[PDB]
Design a protein around this ligand. Structure first.
Ligand code: 30Z
Ligand code: 30Z
Lengths: 115, 116, 116, 115
C-alpha cells in the first residue's frame, strides 16, 4: 500500500467515517487527471488507492469532501473541501500516509512518509 | 479589510515572512479566475487583497506558496502549497481572517469569520 | 507586552472569548508559584499579564481552562485544560505570543517569539 | 489496550521514535501519582501502558518529553514538554488513542475515543 489516507473528527473524537475523496495526478497540460477515489472506512482510513507500479513520480492532489461530512452531521462548515497537493517519490518509492484532522472551521494535514 | 491572511512558522516560532499567495474566485463557467495576490509582511500578514464592494458572494480559493517558503530556508517540504477553498458572503458581508500554521510535513489552517 | 495569549475556536470560527487562564512560574524549590491570571477579551486575546522587569528568566506554565469554555457552550470536551510549559528569556528578554486553537477533542498550540 | 499514545514529527514527516513519556493519575490530595511510562516504538506508538481493570475513572495526565526529542535532533525547542490532561471513562470503559503531532515551536494533540 503506497498511499493511505486517514481522516479524524476533532469535534467528536472519532474516525471520520464515509468521507469521500478523489485523488488526481497533474497532467502535462497542467490539468488534474482523476485516477483514484474512495470513502473512508469505519476506522477513518482509505487503503488500496494505487499500486507501487502505478504510483510513479509526479504531483498528486487528494481532494477530501469535508463539506458533505459536516453537512451529514448538521454542522455548517467553512471549507468547500480539504486539499492535499504533494510531489511523490522524488527519491524513489516511499509509503505515504496522509492524515487529516477535521473541525468545522479548521483542518490540519500531515504526511508520514516511511519505508 | 474583508479578507486577511496570517501565516506562522512552527519550526522557527515566527511569522512566515514574504510568503506568496494567489486568490481565485470561481466563475459562472466553473473555472478559477484570478482575484488578488500578494506576499506576507514582516508580521506574516497580508492585508488589502480586496474591498467590501468587490468581495461579492462566491467560492474563493487561496493558494499559499508554502513550498517556495521552505525551499528558501533550505528545506524540502511535503506539500506543493496550502489551499483554502471556501464560500464567502453567502449570508451577507463578513470579514474573513484565514490563518495558517506551517511545518515542513504538515500544515493547519483555520478561519475567523466576523460579522462587520 | 512581553507575554500575550490568543485563543481561537475551531468549531465556531471565532475568537474564544472569556477563556480563563492561570500562569505559573517554577520556584527554586521546584514548585509552581502563581504568576498571573486573566480571561480572554472579545478578540480572544489576553494582554497585560506581566512586565519586562517582572518577567525574568525561568520556566513558566500557562494553564488554559478549555473545559469550562466548552461546557458553557453545551459541549463535554476531552481535555481538562490546555497546558503550555516553556523556558522564557534564557538568552535575554523576548516577547512571547502563545496561540491556541481549540476543538472539543483536540487542541493545537504554537509560540511566536520575537526579539524586542 | 485501553490507552495508546502515538507521536508524529511534523519536521521530518515520520513517527517520533524513542520519545519518553510518563502517565499520572490525579490523587485525592490533588497531586499527580505516577503510574505508567514508556518510550515510543519505531512506529511512534506506545502500547501496554495499562489494563482495563486498572484504568478506572479519574483524571489522567500524559507528560511527553518533547524537549529531549528535539535536543537529540539538534533543534532548539520551545516547550519543556507536551502535556495531555483528561478525564477518563466518564461513561464507562472506552479505548483511548492520544495522538500528538510535534514541531519545534508547536504541538497539536487529539483524542480518538472508540469502542
Ligand atoms: C492519529 C494520527 C494519524 C495517524 C493514525 C495512524 C497512523 O498509522 C498514522 O500514520 C497516522 C493523527 C491524529 C495525527 C495528527 C495529529 C494532529 C494533527 O493536526 C494531524 O493533522 C494529524
Ligand atoms: C490566528 C493565528 C494567530 C493570530 C495572530 C494575530 C492575529 O491578528 C490573528 O488574527 C491570529 C494562528 C496562531 C492561529 C492558529 C492557527 C492554527 C493552529 O494550529 C494554531 O495552533 C493557531
Amino acid at each position: 500500500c503506497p498511499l493511505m489516507v486517514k481522516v479524524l473528527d476533532a469535534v467528536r473524537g472519532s474516525p471520520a467515517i464515509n468521507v469521500a475523496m478523489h485523488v488526481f495526478r497533474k497532467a502535462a497540460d497542467d490539468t488534474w487527471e482523476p485516477f483514484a477515489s474512495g470513502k473512508t472506512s469505519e476506522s477513518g482510513e482509505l487503503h488500496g488507492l494505487t499500486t507501487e507500479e502505478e504510483f510513479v513520480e509526479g504531483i498528486y492532489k487528494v481532494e477530501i469532501d469535508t463539506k458533505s461530512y459536516w453537512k451529514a452531521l448538521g454542522i455548517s462548515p467553512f471549507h468547500e473541501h480539504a486539499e492535499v497537493v504533494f510531489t511523490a517519490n522524488d527519491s524513489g518509492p516511499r509509503r505515504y500516509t496522509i492524515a487529516a484532522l477535521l473541525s468545522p472551521y479548521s483542518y490540519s494535514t500531515t504526511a508520514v512518509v516511511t519505508n
